Amino acid sequence: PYANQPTVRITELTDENVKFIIENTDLAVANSIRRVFIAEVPIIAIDWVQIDANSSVLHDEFIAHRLGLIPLTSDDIVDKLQYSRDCTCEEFCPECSVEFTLDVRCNEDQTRHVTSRDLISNSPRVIPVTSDDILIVKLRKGQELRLRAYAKKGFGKEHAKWNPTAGVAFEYDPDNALRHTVYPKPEEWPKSEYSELDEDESQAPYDPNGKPERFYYNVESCGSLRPETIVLSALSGLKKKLSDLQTQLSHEIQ
């Protein structure tokens, strides 16, 4: 009638992705954890682009949209930052946003590449993660791009710019022991990288008493957060959501 005792095993940990296995858990918790990786981990991404001068070939909304998609280093600052909608200010004070400034004038005849290197932050902890650098726009001789933009805390549910993951691989039952999928010709299907069968089998023998468990993860970070930070913030956020729901339920019952 109570919680499982989930067990973690980290298989691989790089600076761009983390691979790990969770055993002793129901499918729903693992799926919700993957869902929270994708859509509920808050990061800092550019919003509120104010353009002072844009004589580039790309129109203003195009440049603003490209700026929004630049990932920003938000490893340790995002937790203590606040959502701008909740802050008590003109919507931009240092406690809920990070100012950015871009001012590029192409004077030389050669094509000038406006990269993420040219984005100057007012806070050193928040920079573009590439600082090759992400190309924003190419400028001709005599063209200018000059703007200022801020970066607010949001999560991927609101807009995909705040999604920290560059693809979350998720798997369970690599040998199809539970037969949650039914291969018409199981011999034709390649073995998963976590499969434990020999090269004469195609599926594990069917298990009627089986239950999903030993969920394999591979969380690749876009760069704005370390992958371990993505997973820890994800679990913290899901726990926070459930605790807030318990608070509201207790108020309703009372």
Binding site: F20, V29, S32, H159, L238, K239, Q248, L249
Partner: protein, 115 residues
């Protein structure tokens, strides 16, 4: 034009209750929890934890419409155990599970970094 704002899928507006309980008159000891501004993230996990309880005769959830943001969770229980009690116990179990998972994930990170 008619596109809804992106923020109104997780944000409660003024005078909107996060969660509302209504007894189901068709069956004794059955309740419907309508939670606003939620999705399958909490619905599926709460349903799964409720199914783990032995005293819960029925636990299911549905999103009435994907463009709208509500989950209706129907919970029916044995006559000696209220659905509200089962719901609270399920959430406390999930919170304990995720706290334990946070602790063990931190330990695994420290081991892999030291290793």
């Amino acid at each position: 034009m008619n596109a809804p704002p992106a923020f109104e899928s997780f944000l409660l507006f003024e005078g909107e209750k996060k969660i509302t309980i209504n007894k189901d008159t068709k069956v004794p000891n059955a309740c419907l929890f309508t939670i606003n501004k939620e999705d399958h993230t909490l619905g599926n996990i709460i349903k799964s934890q409720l199914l783990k309880d032995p005293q819960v005769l029925f636990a299911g959830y549905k999103v009435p419409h994907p463009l709208e943001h509500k989950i209706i969770i129907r919970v029916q229980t044995t006559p000696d155990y209220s659905p509200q009690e089962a719901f609270t116990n399920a959430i406390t179990d999930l919170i304990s599970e995720l706290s334990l998972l946070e602790e063990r994930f931190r330990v695994a990170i420290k081991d892999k970094q030291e290793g």
